[PDB]
Every structure is written in C-alpha cells, then in structure tokens.
Coordinates of C-alpha atoms (C1' of nucleotides) and ligand atoms in Angstrom, one line a residue:
Chain S
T1 CA -0.1 0.0 0.0
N2 CA 1.1 3.6 -0.7
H3 CA 3.3 5.1 2.3
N4 CA 3.3 8.7 0.6
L5 CA -0.2 9.9 -0.1
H6 CA 0.4 12.9 1.6
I7 CA 3.1 13.6 -1.2
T8 CA 1.3 11.5 -4.2
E9 CA -2.1 13.2 -3.5
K10 CA -0.4 16.6 -3.9
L11 CA 1.5 15.3 -7.1
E12 CA -1.4 14.0 -8.8
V13 CA -3.2 17.1 -9.0
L14 CA -0.3 18.9 -10.6
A15 CA 0.3 15.7 -13.0
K16 CA -3.2 15.9 -14.0
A17 CA -3.2 19.7 -14.6
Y18 CA 0.0 19.3 -17.2
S19 CA -1.8 16.2 -18.8
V20 CA -5.3 18.3 -19.7
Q21 CA -3.2 21.4 -20.8
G22 CA -1.3 19.2 -23.3
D23 CA 1.9 19.0 -21.7
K24 CA 2.0 15.0 -22.2
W25 CA 5.8 14.6 -21.4
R26 CA 6.1 16.5 -18.1
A27 CA 2.6 14.9 -17.0
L28 CA 4.6 11.3 -18.0
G29 CA 7.2 12.4 -15.7
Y30 CA 5.1 13.1 -12.7
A31 CA 2.8 10.2 -13.4
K32 CA 5.9 7.5 -13.3
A33 CA 7.3 9.3 -10.1
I34 CA 3.8 9.0 -8.5
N35 CA 3.8 5.1 -9.3
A36 CA 7.7 5.0 -7.4
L37 CA 6.6 6.8 -4.7
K38 CA 3.6 4.4 -4.2
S39 CA 5.0 1.1 -5.0
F40 CA 7.8 2.0 -2.4
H41 CA 8.2 0.3 0.7
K42 CA 8.8 3.1 3.8
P43 CA 7.4 6.6 3.5
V44 CA 10.1 8.8 2.1
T45 CA 11.3 11.5 4.7
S46 CA 14.6 12.7 3.1
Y47 CA 15.9 14.6 -0.1
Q48 CA 18.8 12.5 -0.8
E49 CA 16.4 9.6 -0.2
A50 CA 14.1 10.7 -2.7
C51 CA 16.6 11.5 -5.5
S52 CA 18.0 7.5 -5.1
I53 CA 14.6 6.5 -6.2
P54 CA 14.3 5.8 -9.9
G55 CA 11.8 8.0 -11.4
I56 CA 12.8 11.1 -8.9
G57 CA 15.5 13.5 -9.6
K58 CA 16.4 17.1 -8.2
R59 CA 13.1 18.9 -9.3
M60 CA 11.0 16.3 -8.4
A61 CA 12.7 15.4 -4.9
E62 CA 12.5 19.0 -4.1
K63 CA 8.7 19.3 -4.4
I64 CA 8.4 16.2 -2.5
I65 CA 10.6 18.2 0.1
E66 CA 8.4 21.3 0.4
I67 CA 5.6 18.8 0.7
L68 CA 7.0 17.2 4.0
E69 CA 8.1 20.4 5.5
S70 CA 5.4 22.7 4.9
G71 CA 2.8 19.9 4.0
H72 CA 1.9 22.1 1.0
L73 CA 3.0 22.5 -2.4
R74 CA 3.0 26.0 -3.6
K75 CA 2.9 25.0 -7.4
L76 CA -0.8 24.0 -6.8
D77 CA -1.6 27.6 -6.0
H78 CA -1.1 28.4 -9.3
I79 CA -2.7 26.1 -11.5
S80 CA -4.6 28.0 -14.5
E81 CA -8.3 28.4 -13.9
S82 CA -8.9 26.7 -17.2
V83 CA -8.0 23.2 -15.8
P84 CA -11.0 22.2 -14.3
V85 CA -12.9 23.0 -17.3
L86 CA -10.2 21.5 -19.4
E87 CA -10.5 18.3 -17.5
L88 CA -14.4 18.3 -17.7
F89 CA -14.2 18.5 -21.3
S90 CA -11.4 15.8 -21.9
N91 CA -13.5 13.4 -19.7
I92 CA -16.2 13.1 -22.9
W93 CA -15.1 10.1 -24.6
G94 CA -13.7 11.1 -28.1
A95 CA -12.3 14.5 -26.9
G96 CA -8.6 14.9 -25.8
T97 CA -6.3 17.9 -25.0
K98 CA -6.8 19.3 -28.2
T99 CA -10.4 19.3 -28.4
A100 CA -10.8 20.6 -24.8
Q101 CA -8.4 23.5 -25.5
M102 CA -10.3 24.3 -28.9
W103 CA -13.6 24.2 -27.0
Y104 CA -12.2 26.5 -24.2
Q105 CA -11.0 29.2 -26.5
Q106 CA -14.3 29.1 -28.2
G107 CA -16.0 30.4 -24.9
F108 CA -17.2 27.0 -23.6
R109 CA -17.0 26.6 -19.8
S110 CA -19.8 23.9 -19.1
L111 CA -21.2 20.6 -20.8
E112 CA -24.4 22.4 -21.4
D113 CA -22.2 24.7 -23.7
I114 CA -20.7 21.7 -25.2
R115 CA -24.1 20.3 -25.9
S116 CA -26.0 23.3 -27.1
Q117 CA -23.1 24.9 -29.1
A118 CA -20.1 23.1 -29.5
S119 CA -19.3 20.8 -32.6
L120 CA -18.9 17.2 -31.7
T121 CA -17.6 14.2 -33.5
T122 CA -19.9 11.1 -33.8
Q123 CA -17.9 9.5 -31.0
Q124 CA -17.9 12.5 -28.7
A125 CA -21.8 12.8 -28.9
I126 CA -22.1 9.1 -27.4
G127 CA -19.3 10.2 -24.9
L128 CA -21.1 13.1 -24.0
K129 CA -24.7 11.4 -23.7
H130 CA -23.0 8.8 -21.4
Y131 CA -21.0 11.1 -19.5
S132 CA -21.8 10.1 -16.0
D133 CA -21.8 6.2 -16.9
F134 CA -18.4 6.3 -18.3
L135 CA -16.8 8.1 -15.4
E136 CA -17.9 5.2 -12.9
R137 CA -16.0 2.0 -12.4
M138 CA -18.4 -1.2 -12.3
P139 CA -18.3 -3.7 -9.7
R140 CA -16.2 -6.8 -10.9
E141 CA -19.4 -8.9 -10.5
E142 CA -20.8 -6.7 -13.3
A143 CA -17.5 -7.2 -15.4
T144 CA -18.4 -11.1 -15.2
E145 CA -22.0 -10.7 -16.5
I146 CA -20.8 -8.6 -19.3
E147 CA -18.0 -11.1 -20.1
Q148 CA -20.4 -14.0 -19.9
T149 CA -22.8 -12.0 -22.3
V150 CA -20.1 -11.7 -25.0
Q151 CA -18.8 -15.1 -24.5
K152 CA -22.2 -16.9 -24.8
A153 CA -23.2 -15.0 -27.8
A154 CA -19.9 -15.6 -29.5
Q155 CA -20.0 -19.6 -28.5
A156 CA -23.3 -19.6 -30.2
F157 CA -21.8 -19.4 -33.5
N158 CA -18.8 -21.9 -32.6
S159 CA -18.5 -23.4 -29.3
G160 CA -14.9 -23.8 -29.8
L161 CA -14.1 -19.9 -29.5
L162 CA -12.1 -18.9 -26.7
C163 CA -13.5 -15.6 -24.8
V164 CA -11.4 -14.2 -22.1
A165 CA -11.7 -11.1 -20.1
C166 CA -8.6 -9.2 -20.0
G167 CA -7.8 -5.5 -18.7
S168 CA -8.3 -4.7 -15.3
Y169 CA -10.5 -7.6 -14.9
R170 CA -8.1 -10.0 -15.5
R171 CA -5.5 -8.0 -13.2
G172 CA -8.1 -9.2 -10.5
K173 CA -9.3 -5.7 -9.7
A174 CA -12.4 -5.0 -7.4
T175 CA -13.9 -2.6 -9.9
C176 CA -13.3 -2.2 -13.6
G177 CA -13.6 1.0 -15.7
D178 CA -14.9 -1.1 -18.8
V179 CA -14.7 -4.7 -19.9
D180 CA -12.0 -5.9 -22.4
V181 CA -12.7 -9.3 -24.0
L182 CA -10.1 -11.1 -26.3
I183 CA -11.7 -13.8 -28.7
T184 CA -9.7 -16.3 -30.5
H185 CA -9.8 -19.9 -31.4
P186 CA -7.3 -23.0 -31.0
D187 CA -7.9 -24.4 -34.5
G188 CA -6.2 -21.2 -35.6
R189 CA -8.9 -20.4 -38.2
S190 CA -12.4 -20.3 -36.8
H191 CA -11.7 -16.8 -35.3
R192 CA -12.4 -15.3 -38.9
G193 CA -15.5 -14.3 -40.2
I194 CA -16.9 -14.2 -36.7
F195 CA -16.5 -10.4 -35.4
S196 CA -19.4 -9.0 -37.8
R197 CA -22.1 -11.7 -36.7
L198 CA -21.1 -11.3 -33.3
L199 CA -21.7 -7.8 -33.2
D200 CA -25.0 -8.3 -35.0
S201 CA -26.1 -10.7 -32.5
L202 CA -25.3 -8.6 -29.8
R203 CA -26.9 -5.6 -31.2
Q204 CA -30.5 -7.2 -32.1
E205 CA -30.2 -8.8 -28.8
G206 CA -30.2 -5.0 -27.4
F207 CA -27.2 -5.6 -25.4
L208 CA -24.9 -3.1 -27.3
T209 CA -26.1 0.4 -27.5
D210 CA -23.8 2.4 -29.6
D211 CA -20.3 1.7 -31.4
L212 CA -17.5 3.9 -31.0
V213 CA -14.9 2.1 -33.2
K214 CA -15.1 -0.9 -35.5
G215 CA -12.1 -2.2 -37.1
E216 CA -10.8 -5.4 -38.5
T217 CA -10.2 -7.2 -35.1
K218 CA -11.0 -4.3 -32.9
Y219 CA -14.1 -3.1 -31.5
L220 CA -15.5 -0.5 -28.9
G221 CA -18.6 0.2 -27.9
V222 CA -21.3 0.9 -25.4
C223 CA -23.3 -2.1 -23.7
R224 CA -25.7 -2.4 -21.0
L225 CA -27.4 -5.5 -19.0
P226 CA -31.0 -6.3 -19.1
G227 CA -33.2 -5.2 -16.2
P228 CA -33.5 -2.1 -13.9
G229 CA -30.7 -0.2 -12.0
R230 CA -28.3 -0.8 -15.0
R231 CA -25.9 1.5 -16.3
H232 CA -24.4 2.0 -19.8
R233 CA -20.7 0.4 -19.9
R234 CA -17.8 0.6 -22.2
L235 CA -16.9 -2.8 -23.9
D236 CA -13.9 -3.4 -25.8
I237 CA -13.3 -6.7 -28.1
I238 CA -10.4 -7.9 -30.0
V239 CA -10.5 -11.1 -32.2
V240 CA -7.0 -12.4 -33.0
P241 CA -5.7 -15.8 -34.7
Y242 CA -4.6 -18.2 -32.2
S243 CA -1.0 -17.7 -33.3
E244 CA -1.1 -14.2 -31.6
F245 CA -2.7 -15.5 -28.5
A246 CA 0.0 -15.2 -26.0
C247 CA 1.1 -11.5 -27.2
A248 CA -2.6 -10.6 -27.9
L249 CA -3.4 -11.8 -24.3
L250 CA -0.3 -10.1 -22.4
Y251 CA -1.0 -6.7 -24.5
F252 CA -4.8 -6.8 -23.5
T253 CA -4.1 -7.5 -19.9
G254 CA -1.7 -4.8 -19.3
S255 CA -1.5 -2.2 -17.3
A256 CA -0.8 0.2 -19.9
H257 CA 2.3 1.6 -18.0
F258 CA 3.2 -2.3 -17.7
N259 CA 3.0 -2.6 -21.4
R260 CA 4.9 0.6 -22.1
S261 CA 7.7 -0.4 -19.8
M262 CA 7.8 -4.3 -21.3
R263 CA 8.0 -2.7 -24.7
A264 CA 10.6 0.0 -23.7
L265 CA 12.7 -3.0 -22.2
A266 CA 12.4 -5.2 -25.6
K267 CA 13.5 -2.1 -27.6
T268 CA 16.7 -2.0 -25.6
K269 CA 17.3 -5.5 -26.3
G270 CA 17.0 -5.4 -30.4
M271 CA 13.9 -6.6 -30.1
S272 CA 10.2 -5.2 -30.9
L273 CA 6.8 -6.2 -28.8
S274 CA 3.4 -5.8 -30.1
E275 CA 0.0 -7.4 -29.6
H276 CA 0.9 -9.4 -32.4
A277 CA 4.4 -10.8 -31.3
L278 CA 7.7 -10.4 -29.9
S279 CA 10.4 -9.7 -32.9
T280 CA 14.1 -10.3 -32.6
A281 CA 16.8 -8.9 -34.8
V282 CA 14.8 -5.7 -35.4
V283 CA 16.7 -3.1 -37.4
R284 CA 15.5 0.1 -35.9
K285 CA 12.0 1.3 -37.2
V286 CA 13.5 -0.2 -40.7
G287 CA 14.1 -3.7 -40.1
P288 CA 11.0 -6.2 -39.6
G289 CA 13.1 -8.6 -37.9
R290 CA 12.2 -12.3 -37.0
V291 CA 9.2 -13.4 -35.1
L292 CA 10.1 -15.3 -32.2
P293 CA 8.0 -18.2 -30.8
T294 CA 5.7 -17.4 -27.7
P295 CA 3.1 -20.2 -27.2
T296 CA 2.2 -18.7 -23.8
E297 CA 2.8 -15.5 -21.9
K298 CA 5.6 -17.0 -19.9
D299 CA 7.4 -17.3 -23.1
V300 CA 7.5 -13.5 -23.8
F301 CA 9.0 -13.0 -20.2
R302 CA 11.5 -15.7 -20.9
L303 CA 12.9 -14.3 -23.9
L304 CA 13.1 -10.7 -22.5
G305 CA 15.0 -12.3 -19.5
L306 CA 12.3 -11.5 -17.0
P307 CA 10.5 -13.2 -14.0
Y308 CA 7.2 -14.0 -15.0
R309 CA 4.9 -11.5 -13.2
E310 CA 1.0 -12.8 -12.4
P311 CA -1.6 -10.7 -14.1
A312 CA -2.4 -9.0 -10.4
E313 CA 1.4 -7.9 -10.3
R314 CA 1.0 -6.1 -13.5
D315 CA 0.1 -2.5 -12.5
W316 CA 3.4 -1.0 -13.7
Chain L
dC1 C1' -2.2 13.5 -41.7
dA2 C1' -3.6 15.2 -36.4
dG3 C1' -6.2 13.5 -32.7
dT4 C1' -7.8 10.0 -29.7
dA5 C1' -7.6 5.7 -27.9
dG6 C1' -6.6 0.8 -26.1
Chain R
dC1 C1' 20.3 16.3 -26.8
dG2 C1' 16.1 14.0 -27.4
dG3 C1' 13.2 9.6 -26.4
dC4 C1' 9.6 8.5 -23.1
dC5 C1' 5.2 1.8 -26.6
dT6 C1' 3.2 0.5 -30.3
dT7 C1' -0.8 -0.4 -33.4
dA8 C1' -5.2 0.8 -34.8
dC9 C1' -9.3 3.6 -35.8
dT10 C1' -11.5 7.9 -37.8
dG11 C1' -12.3 12.0 -40.9
Chain Q
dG1 C1' 8.8 16.0 -15.5
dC2 C1' 13.1 11.5 -16.0
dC3 C1' 16.9 9.2 -18.2
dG4 C1' 20.7 7.4 -21.1
Ligands
1GC1 N1 0.7 -0.8 -25.3 C1 -0.3 0.0 -24.6 N2 -1.3 -0.9 -24.2 C2 -2.1 -0.1 -23.9 C3 -2.6 1.3 -23.7 N3 -3.7 1.5 -23.2 C4 -4.3 0.5 -22.9 N4 -3.5 -0.6 -23.1 C5 -3.8 -2.0 -22.9 C6 -3.6 -2.3 -21.4 C7 -4.7 -2.1 -20.9 O1 -4.9 -3.2 -19.7 C8 -5.8 -2.7 -21.8 C9 -7.2 -2.3 -21.9 O2 -7.2 -0.6 -21.8 P1 -8.2 0.3 -20.7 O3 -9.4 -0.9 -20.7 O4 -8.3 1.3 -21.4 C10 -7.7 0.3 -19.0 P2 -7.6 -1.5 -18.0 O5 -6.3 -1.5 -17.5 O6 -8.6 -2.3 -18.6 O7 -8.5 -0.8 -16.6 P3 -9.6 -0.2 -16.4 O8 -9.5 1.3 -16.4 O9 -10.4 -0.4 -17.8 O10 -10.4 -0.9 -15.2 O11 -5.4 -2.2 -23.0 C11 -1.4 2.3 -24.2 O12 -1.5 3.4 -24.0 N5 -0.4 1.4 -24.8
MG2 MG1 -10.3 -2.2 -19.5
NA3 NA1 -12.0 12.1 -23.3
NA4 NA1 -10.8 -1.0 -22.5
NA5 NA1 -3.4 5.4 -24.7

DNA sequence: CAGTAG
DNA sequence: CGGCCTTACTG
DNA sequence: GCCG
C-alpha cells in the first residue's frame, strides 16, 4: 500500500494539470514519479533519499521536500483556472486535450455549452450522452456478467471460440472502468468471419447500444445489461488468430504502463513487442526482424530475460 | 495527416 | 540532446 | 517531469 499519500495526492493534481493542458511528457514524468512513490516500501523522509529512487530527480525531490516540510505545494496555488474545465471537457470519451483546449478558446465552460453550441464528432456525442456512466467503475461482478454475455453470444456461432476478459478484470481488480474481451480459436482459423456476426447478434439482443470504433479485429462500443438499475458500460472486444494469442493476451491484460515498460525493455534488447508478437533482430523502425515463438505469456517474459509476473502483479 | 484511444 | 510503446481507427 |  502507498506510504506517501501525503505526497502523491499533491503531485497527482499537478500531474493531471499538465496532462489536460497538453504537456504530456511532463505529465508522464510526474505519473512515473507517483507510481514510484506509491509502490515504495517506507514513507520517504529525506531529499537525498528521494533522489536515489528511480523516476525521481532533483526537481521532483525538491517538490517532495516542500510537501514534507510545509505540508503544501506552492505550485498547486498557481494552476490555471482553465484546468477544471479542460478536465471536464476531456472526460468526454473521444475528446482529448486538443479538443478541450479548442472548446475552451471558443468560450465554452460547461457541458451545457458543449451540448448546445460545440461541434461534436459522432464518438464525442456518444461520450457526452453517457458522461456520468463512463466516469464510473463497475463492480467486478458486473464485468463478469458482461464477459459471459459476449462469450455466450460468441460460442453460439462456434462453441470452440475462446473468450477471455482481460484488462483490469484479469488483473483481479475489485472494480473495472470497462470490460475488455479477447476472442480467439485454438484451431487457428475459426476466429475469422465472426466479428461482424457477433456484433449483429449482440446488437439485435439489445445489449450493444452504441459503437465507437469498429475495425478489422478491434471493436470499442457501449453496452448495457438487461433489467432495471443498469448503467451503460464501455466494452472493448478484440479478435485475434491463435498464433498471436500469447502476445494479444499479454497486451490486453496490461496494465498500460506495464505494457509500455515491457515494450521499452524489448527495444533496448534489439527486439520489438506488440499485441501481434515479440520480434528479434529488429533494425531500428527499418527492419522487420524475426518473429520469436511465444506459445504462452511466460515465453515472452523468458525471451526478455524477465521473471514471470502474474496478471495481478502488472500494475506497472 | 492529427487527434484519440486501447 | 532528445526519447519517453506500439498499433489502430476516424475523418 | 526523468533518464541514458
Ligand atoms: N501498449 C499499450 N497498451 C495499452 C494502452 N492503453 C491500454 N492498453 C492495454 C493495457 C490495458 O490493460 C488494456 C485495456 O485498456 P483499458 O481498458 O483502457 C484500461 P484497464 O487496464 O482495463 O483498466 P480499466 O481502467 O479499464 O479498469 O489495453 C497504451 O497506451 N499502450
Ligand atoms: Mg479495461
Ligand atoms: Na476524452
Ligand atoms: Na478497455
Ligand atoms: Na493510450
């Protein structure tokens, strides 16, 4: 458990401020700093003590000091008054920092303003209409029901189709921001020509209420379980050939920061990691390299010279 | 392509 | 100094 | 932001 909440709680505000304003790299710096402070072992108390920590340098250590000596972060007192609004706006699925800034420059300050006067993409309109629902994390139990709803509908076409809920669900979280379902078939071919039909079925069943993104093997949409007391939830589905199962599973289980770190490691070792496969002899890109055999997730860690980590231990 | 997202 | 993951979808 |  986090031993420096008195520190992170302050930094998160600043990290979020930079994020919504578009300074993504700086925000990344803060995010990683925060992840460190959190996954630490004992409440930090010294400057030199902070600096040592990977992900914390002079400037960050200085800020962690001001927090422990004054219990305050003067920087927080100078956050632009546009931030709360930029955050409100970018919390609409489909709208990022650029759109939020544009809307802000156009004079908009509330979702009422967005609704009545802003230009909205099809995705943003859907994000807006489910604004409150998409900000909520659902109980794990509900995520199971959604997974089962997809698996059932899928297996109705081919009982052999393998369906696994990945993301935060597979990492064992108590609550889930959405549901991520990976679909493949051990026969290495039956997975083809199903996606479309699956969506139609789920749609005719009234389960899928809106689509956000629909690609060849990737679907991002909105669903809602039957009955009263149900809210709309985000649902992501990916269909992959069995030969890419391990890497697809690894990718879709995350976390995002874990994936980025793992991919970064692969890069330093002349390799390349994607949801498709782990490649070696990659000429940085410029050279495709060779695809390494990875039957299971453990193989990927092995080939990268890493101790296997259970899904629950992949927060970053 | 830029923006957004997983 | 300059990357900070990689691929995919939208329009 | 941090780090090589
Ligand atoms: N490489 C990479 N993988 C990513 C990224 N973002 C997501 N993934 C992978 C890893 C991530 O686990 C998975 C699903 O992403 P969500 O569903 O959006 C976030 P989840 O972890 O499920 O937790 P939730 O907040 O939903 O409860 O896609 C990214 O930027 N990069
Ligand atoms: Mg998820
Ligand atoms: Na958004
Ligand atoms: Na997701
Ligand atoms: Na992302």
